[PDB]
Scaffold this active site. Structure first.
Site, PDB file in Angstrom:
ATOM      1  N   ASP B 305       0.746  -1.253   0.000  1.00 54.54           N
ATOM      2  CA  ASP B 305       0.000   0.000   0.000  1.00 54.54           C
ATOM      3  C   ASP B 305       0.775   1.302   0.000  1.00 54.54           C
ATOM      4  O   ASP B 305       0.466   2.209  -0.775  1.00 54.54           O
ATOM      5  CB  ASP B 305      -1.012   0.000   1.145  1.00 54.54           C
ATOM      6  CG  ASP B 305      -2.116  -1.024   0.941  1.00 54.54           C
ATOM      7  OD1 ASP B 305      -2.682  -1.072  -0.170  1.00 54.54           O
ATOM      8  OD2 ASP B 305      -2.424  -1.776   1.884  1.00 54.54           O
ATOM      9  N   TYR B 391     -10.104  -1.378   2.710  1.00 57.47           N
ATOM     10  CA  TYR B 391      -9.669  -1.196   4.098  1.00 57.47           C
ATOM     11  C   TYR B 391      -9.340   0.236   4.477  1.00 57.47           C
ATOM     12  O   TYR B 391      -9.017   1.082   3.643  1.00 57.47           O
ATOM     13  CB  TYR B 391      -8.444  -2.056   4.432  1.00 57.47           C
TER      14      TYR B 391
END
Ligand SMILES: [Cu+2]
Ligand SMILES: [Cu+2]
Lengths: 661, 661
Positions: B305, B391
């Site tokens: 990420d 998320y």
């Protein structure tokens, strides 16, 4: 009948009236005998009886009181049960080779006895303290723990001696080098352990911490900081009916006793009309704080605080605004004194709710997060704080809105210290935290006792280990070698459960109901123990520490349920050599008993290993410890979704507000 | 000169003016070329230059901007540096076999391209979705991670496809079975991974979580709970001067960039006039969320990420009152868009102080705790929250009054889901969290990058392991077998530092200054890393995951400091095969370089292993992660003792008040 009034709930602690009724009854039974009371507490009803009463219209369990007394000139103790309704002793027995928990009264006189002892006075003079300054000598009265020279033949205490130049000083910067052994019953010094290498009292200033001391030490105090006020104008969301708590669908009974302190029972969660049991009882059942210096007589420092002093007996009355901030609901504790009269500790337990950050959140990147939902979390805290001479143990039982239960502990207070010579090296067993001050290494270990009832009766326990697929990289089954799963090892017999936390597999443990299944996942409903502060017991096998705390050798111990299986180091801990089949050792037996799908007891050992540093002296900053029990496969979805969001905007609402799309 | 105005502090992020100045400069340099901007950010000054400027009256470091651009029809990227003062490109190079971080703009168009792709449409029809309902098909645009079929030859994205019956639905209960591969530059589908076993769209209702949905699902929402208000009538105690923070003796610079998000620099503690350095820089440098299903094409789910999307680029503008409760101080973030124009994210970082329970406490049992001192703790929180498609990562950098620094993370948002057939078993690689929904197992791993300056320059690192004395029970050296100590293993070369957390020894790590000594303990001053949520990397050695994240294989990696050694998986992460000497693999080298008493970099791998359960769906309750850096032997005593106590009564004062003794 003069029988005391029955309590609102079968698990309520004994009232002051019941305590007095119990002691009057015992005194009458032992008429003519000179007896003193050591313990008078509620004898909780049998698990089966309670549940039948609670859910099957069963009869109200008999209100019973458990007592422990000493008789002048008689070795050991006598214990028994009093049926409060009929004001009669229904069970009693003598235990002549055992010593009971040390009460505040038992410990309060030790300091005065050593101060007036000629041998002790001589030692003080030899240490550099004039005989006419004995009023400046202090001592923390400790259980002797265990000394092979006397066993349980005499009820003994050992005194860790310190010196105060002024009554307002913190004595711990000035420990003396010797250790007096005192006969509790006779109130006299029977021996003094004296080191081969003598160290006279430190001549340095005391290491103090009150504001007046700090002003002298450093420039002055920091300015008063801007206040952070917490208010609940419309009250709290939790509801207390006697000792029964109701909050965020959780319902449980808040009990308390002289030994374990807080005891949470009959814990259930209201799953949209379906009240589901979780735990029948949960609490701290024992502790051990084994010190790491091999030098005599320091092996005698491995206090089992709960069983030797009592988390209840040592609990502090909580000061509103300071200990517990916000809108607080307090509970008092009631015990018996030596004479058999009820004694009360005000505000022994405080209850309140606090904001706990975010419960959950999610935003859609598609409209730059315009579509978003945020819900803040609130936690329910049931706490107490007890003092074990130098240390303070702050205990917080925490209930959360996702259905999880957590135990948070903060250790503070003062380091246990022993004297260090100018030319003496403290390491490797301790740290020189101040001139002439040796703070010995030690561990703080606790035994969490869980009596589960996960979604009902018939439970099991298992270890869960994360593991890579056994298939190799490049195989058809694990081509890119990324496959991994959770290996669940269900404990069949007691022996299978004796397990430790393993970092290599990020181990967790499940307490589940094999009789039920989650309609979505197909897994049994459960609460998962997520706990990583699980130190191995550093004391060796066969050591005094390992023998007196058989439960501390494993992170997890699971045994069959039996009534009155509360204390893992035995019922009367002080001075037990660790030899014999009692406590956890007795419950484990040959390790062959079944613990799969039945009534079980789950004992978890957790805590920390403390290597002192100057930052911990002269007053130590709170050190945190925590463990959590999470529902996994218990619910079919996040149980907190019906809680009003703090903020929420849908995609359609966003389009309308956004502007006009 | 048209040079943009210099910032107040050398570490301040580039201002919108500087960003525009940088892009104008780059455009001029590449005059005639059709270029687009991928990254325009501050190129931090060399460590030595900064420190010399900061403490040796050294010259102000040059204000530099690092850029990454793409040129139409050209493979890979071009990167370089712009000297803002002289508005000129001073460094530049082409990297044709690399792919850069995916910006919001890079990802925003993917959904529309798959919706309009004939092959994709056909797949939707085949899956049970009419061609005229493509507006109901959605997809989370992911980096392809790595696909050996294309390498870095084309800039690719993979699309995880989902379906919404209504725009307000949470799509995750309805994933489709295929995975389109999209050419980012050409904006077109070049391939679609189709499973052998087809699964048509779920016909169940969507698993939703907004209030209107909950009212339909369960009876209704819970009543609004009584409010818990937090106020600071007299303001806050912290002071912000630009990005410079001052609170409870701590002083540091709060930076921020597109990739790491929050970056804390030049951290020092004012020890009663003696300003002592602690860390030069600390932040999260990379992450990897490796999924555990071996089935194609799920091996492509192991997003890094930070390096592939950017914790800065993905950060949410924080909503006051909801995300950050209380009196908050906000900071904005500035980046560049594809055209080279500054873009701003409002309230990207929130700063505030909160009550944090007890800092420390102690009462004397002698006067029933009348003698007592209690001081409440206050913590300083610097936070951000970023969204990675499904998320949400809530990051909280916490400073405490005992001098400790903590990193708290809360994971929330939605589970990554893939379709599950009616007759399909999800285990052992995943969990059926809802009908036809398979939530695959995965880990969340982070790389904490610490550039230490513990009490000055010249640092070392070591592993600390608790161990029983080697001497046996019954020996003169360990008579009662209770002796234990801390074994410190100082890392000499890089190779020595490659270590993992070990539960068997309750391992911790020290970052210390071997050039100094604590006057009391005789040990070097240090900050100890106390971290137990350190999962082993479950993906096998040689796996795609292990190769692209060489840093994740060990809990701790310590290498020599070098300027620009920021990102452990390399500078341009997307589509790197993991083959080659770059990032952590390059820094480790042959492992022979010295890391004892020199300038070092400490990379810590921590995180969790997630085995989904229904409780996590359809919206997941926050899951906590935390690590702490504590001063040990840094101070000579508890540094918070000069903080005004919440309550304090000495023994002498107690006697006076008590009554009259
Ligand atoms: Cu300790
Ligand atoms: Cu996860």
């Amino acid at each position: 009948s003069a029988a005391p009034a029955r309590p609102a709930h079968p698990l309520d602690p004994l009232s002051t009236a019941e305590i007095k009724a119990a002691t009057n009854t015992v005194k009458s039974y032992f008429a003519g005998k000179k007896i003193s009371f050591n313990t008078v507490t509620l004898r909780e009803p049998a698990r089966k009886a309670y549940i039948q009463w609670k859910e099957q219209g069963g009869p109200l369990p008999p209100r019973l009181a458990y007592y422990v007394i000493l008789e002048a000139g008689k070795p050991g103790v006598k214990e028994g049960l009093v049926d409060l309704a009929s004001l009669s002793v229904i069970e009693t027995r003598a235990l002549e080779t055992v010593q009971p928990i040390l009460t505040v009264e038992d410990l309060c006189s030790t300091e005065e006895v050593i101060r007036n002892d000629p041998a002790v006075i001589e030692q003080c003079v030899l240490s550099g303290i004039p005989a006419n300054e004995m009023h400046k000598v202090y001592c923390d009265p400790w259980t002797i723990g265990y000394d092979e020279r006397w066993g349980t033949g005499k009820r003994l205490q050992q005194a860790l001696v310190y010196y105060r130049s002024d009554e307002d000083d913190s004595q711990y910067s000035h420990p003396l080098d010797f250790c007096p052994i005192v006969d509790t019953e006779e109130k006299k010094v029977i021996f003094i352990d004296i080191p081969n290498r003598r160290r006279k009292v430190s001549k340095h200033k005391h290491a103090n911490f009150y504001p007046k001391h700090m002003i002298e030490k450093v420039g002055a105090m920091r300015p008063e900081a801007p206040p952070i006020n917490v208010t609940q104008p419309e009250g709290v969301s939790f509801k207390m009916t006697g000792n029964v708590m109701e909050w965020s669908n959780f319902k449980f009974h808040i009990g308390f006793n002289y030994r374990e302190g807080i005891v949470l029972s009959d814990v259930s969660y209201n799953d949209h009309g379906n009240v589901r049991p979780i735990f029948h009882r949960i609490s701290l059942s024992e502790m051990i704080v084994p010190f790491g210096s091999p030098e005599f007589p320091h092996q005698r420092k491995h206090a089992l605080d709960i069983g030797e002093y009592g988390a209840g007996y040592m609990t502090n009355p909580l000061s509103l605004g300071c200990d517990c901030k916000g809108v607080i609901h307090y509970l008092d504790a009631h015990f018996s004194d030596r004479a058999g009269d009820p004694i009360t500790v005000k505000n022994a337990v405080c209850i309140h709710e606090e904001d706990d950050g975010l419960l959950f959140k999610h935003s859609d990147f598609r409209d730059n997060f315009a579509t978003s939902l945020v819900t803040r979390a609130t936690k329910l805290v049931v706490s107490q704080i007890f003092t074990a001479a130098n240390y303070e143990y702050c205990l917080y039982w925490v209930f959360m809105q996702d259905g999880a239960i957590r135990l948070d502990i903060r250790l503070t207070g003062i380091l246990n210290t022993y004297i260090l010579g100018d030319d003496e090296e403290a390491g490797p067993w301790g740290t020189r935290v101040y001139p002439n001050v040796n703070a010995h290494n030690h561990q703080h270990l606790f035994s969490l006792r869980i009596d589960p009832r996960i979604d009902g009766d018939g439970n099991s326990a298992a270890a869960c280990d994360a593991k890579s697929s056994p298939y190799p990289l490049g195989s058809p089954e694990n081509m890119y070698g990324n496959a991994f799963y959770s290996e669940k090892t269900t404990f069949k017999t007691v022996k299978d459960s004796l397990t430790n936390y393993e970092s290599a597999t990020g181990r967790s443990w499940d307490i589940f109901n094999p009789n039920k299944v989650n309609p979505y996942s197909g897994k049994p409903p459960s609460y998962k123990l997520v706990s990583t502060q699980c130190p191995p017991l550093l004391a060796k096998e066969g050591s005094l520490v390992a023998k007196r705390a058989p439960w501390a050798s494993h992170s997890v111990n699971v045994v069959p349920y039996k009534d009155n299986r509360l204390y893992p180091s035995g019922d009367h801990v002080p001075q037990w050599s660790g030899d014999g089949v009692r406590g956890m050792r007795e419950w484990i037996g040959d390790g062959s008993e079944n613990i799969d799908n039945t009534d079980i007891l789950f004992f978890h050992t957790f805590g920390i290993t403390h290597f002192p540093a100057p930052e911990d002296f002269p007053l130590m900053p709170a050190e945190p410890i925590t463990l959590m029990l999470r529902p996994r496969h218990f619910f079919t979805e996040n149980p907190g979704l019906d809680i009003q969001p703090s903020y929420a905007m849908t995609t359609s609402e966003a389009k309308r507000a956004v502007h006009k799309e």
